[PDB]
């Protein structure tokens, strides 16, 4: 029969699941990073191919993939030519797109992915739209990185005696294992361009906030609202009244509270969703070749 594979090619690993056109599970596979910025073009393609081959237990007829790192036309031009060789029919979209389809089942909608970085992805039935998601320096409002940076800067001002030291102070220092300004500065010398390290601090902000720290609550509230404003914008342009929320930042009770409060004041319904990105990739493929999504889901 026809072998359809859905792939979620991320920055850390690549996951693939295979199904026929009648909704029957065939298999699953995994490989290294699918983000070519992390392992290079050839290796990324190689990992995606491996994952696909393992899940399909051989060659695949159709492959739908959600890829991380295609944030500029130049990226697509570099990636598409090779990725298209993986199977006779290949549908390629942003990793955020398959996360959306996993919930909308291929229908119009908007999804917010707030983790280390942040982005708002949408589909209007004709094309895919995006706001944000262009990196830590230029964008990523309300992401773990954004929150971590805000915390670091507040901590510095506390050390300078410009603001009172709150619970956040100790939480941040413990998180990166530094005991004072001298060590914080030393830390900046080798950690300033390390995205993951800065983002790891969002965890300390969440803890401080749960313990009642006004400074930490403010960072979460402000970050959530900055990104939520962008989610409302895309929902309005797409013409939808609901948005899906995904990513580690939503695991923060306070961040989720303020994010949803902003959406509700605008009359927007939110939903954490309930499916995996790879399944969204299978749905992406189903829509392309015409297989019945109802046989796949429920």
Which of 126, 127, 160, 190 is close enough to bind a copy of itself by CB under 8 A? 160
Residue with tokens 């280390």: 116
Residue 30, phi-psi category: left (phi > 0), alpha (psi -120 to 50), beta (remainder): beta
Q: From residue 22 to residue 61, what is the string marking binding to a copy of itself with x (rule CB under 8 A)?
A: ---------------x------------------------
Q: Count of alpha carbons within 13 Å of 179, Cβ hemisphere only?
A: 0
Minimal CA–CA distance to 28: which of 16, 43, 40, 19? 16
- Quick one: 38 or 210, whose CB is closer to a copy of itself? 38
In the complex, minimum distance from the CB of residue 73 to a copy of itself, in angstroms, rounded to a whole number:
4
In the complex, minimum distance from the CB of residue 71 to a copy of itself, in angstroms, rounded to a whole number:
5
209 is in an annotated binding site: no
The reply on whether position 174 binds a copy of itself by CB under 8 A is no
Tell me the backbone φ, ψ of residue 30, rounded to 5 degrees. -145, 155
248 is in an annotated binding site: yes
Sort strands 128-132 and 118-123 into parallel, antiparallel or unpaired: antiparallel
The reply on whether position 265 binds a copy of itself by CB under 8 A is no
| C-alpha–C-alpha distance, residues 252 and 4, integer Å | 36
**Separation of CA 163 from chain center:** 34
Q: Indicate the SS3 state at residue 290.
A: coil
The reply on whether position 181 binds a copy of itself by CB under 8 A is yes
In the complex, minimum distance from the CB of residue 185 to a copy of itself, in angstroms, rounded to a whole number:
4
The reply on whether position 74 binds a copy of itself by CB under 8 A is yes
- Quick one: 1 or 138, whose CB is closer to a copy of itself? 138
Residues 6+ apart with CB under 8 A from 182: none
Q: Which residues ranging from 197 to 236 are in contact with a copy of itself (CB under 8 A)?
A: 198, 229-230, 233
The reply on whether position 162 binds a copy of itself by CB under 8 A is yes
The DSSP secondary structure of 163-177, one letter per residue, reads S---HHHHHHHHHTT
- Quick one: 197 or 261, whose CB is closer to a copy of itself? 197
Residues 6+ apart with CB under 8 A from 229: 262
The reply on whether position 80 binds a copy of itself by CB under 8 A is no
Q: Indicate the SS3 state at residue 19.
A: strand
The reply on whether position 290 binds a copy of itself by CB under 8 A is no
Tell me the backbone φ, ψ of residue 29, rounded to 5 degrees. -150, 165
Q: Which residues are annotated as a binding site for ADP?
A: 11-13, 15, 116, 199, 203, 206, 248, 251
Residues that bind a copy of itself (CB under 8 A): 37, 71-74, 131-132, 134-139, 149, 152-153, 156, 160-162, 181-186, 188-189, 192-193, 198, 229-230, 233, 237
Q: Which residues are annotated as a binding site?
A: 11-13, 15, 116, 199, 203, 206, 248, 251
């Amino acid at each position: 029969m026809m072998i359809i594979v859905g792939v979620d090619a991320g920055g850390t690993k690549t996951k693939a699941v295979a199904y026929d056109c009648e909704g029957n599970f065939i298999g699953e596979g995994s490989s290294g990073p699918g983000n070519y910025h992390n392992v290079g073009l050839t290796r990324a393609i190689e990992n995606i191919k491996e994952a696909v081959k393992i899940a399909a237990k051989g060659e695949a007829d159709v492959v739908g993939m959600g890829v991380a790192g295609l944030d500029s036309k130049f990226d697509w031009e570099n990636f598409t030519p090779l990725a298209s060789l993986i199977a006779p029919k290949v549908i390629i979209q942003h990793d955020g797109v398959i996360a959306l389809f996993a919930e909308t089942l291929g229908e119009p909608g908007v999804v917010v992915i707030a983790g280390t970085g942040s982005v708002v992805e949408g589909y209007n039935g004709k094309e895919f739209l995006r706001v944000g998601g262009r990196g830590w320096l230029l964008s990523d409002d309300g992401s773990a990185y954004w929150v971590g940076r805000k915390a670091l800067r507040k901590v510095l001002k506390m050390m300078d005696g410009l603001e009172n030291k709150t619970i956040l102070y100790n939480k941040v220092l413990k998180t990166i294992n530094v005991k004072d300004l001298d060590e914080l500065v030393m830390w900046s010398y080798t950690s300033s361009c390390q995205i993951d390290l800065v983002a790891s601090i969002a965890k300390a902000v969440d803890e401080a906030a749960n313990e009642g720290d006004t400074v930490a609550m403010d960072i979460l509230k402000q970050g959530a609202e900055l990104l939520a404003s962008q989610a409302v914008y895309l929902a309005r342009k797409i013409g939808t009244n609901k948005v899906y929320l995904k990513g580690g930042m939503f695991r923060s009770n306070i961040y989720h509270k303020f994010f949803t409060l902003y959406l509700e004041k605008e009359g927007i319904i939110s939903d954490l969703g309930k499916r995996s990105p790879e399944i969204g990739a299978v749905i992406l493929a189903y829509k392309e070749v015409g297989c019945d999504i109802k046989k796949l889901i429920s």
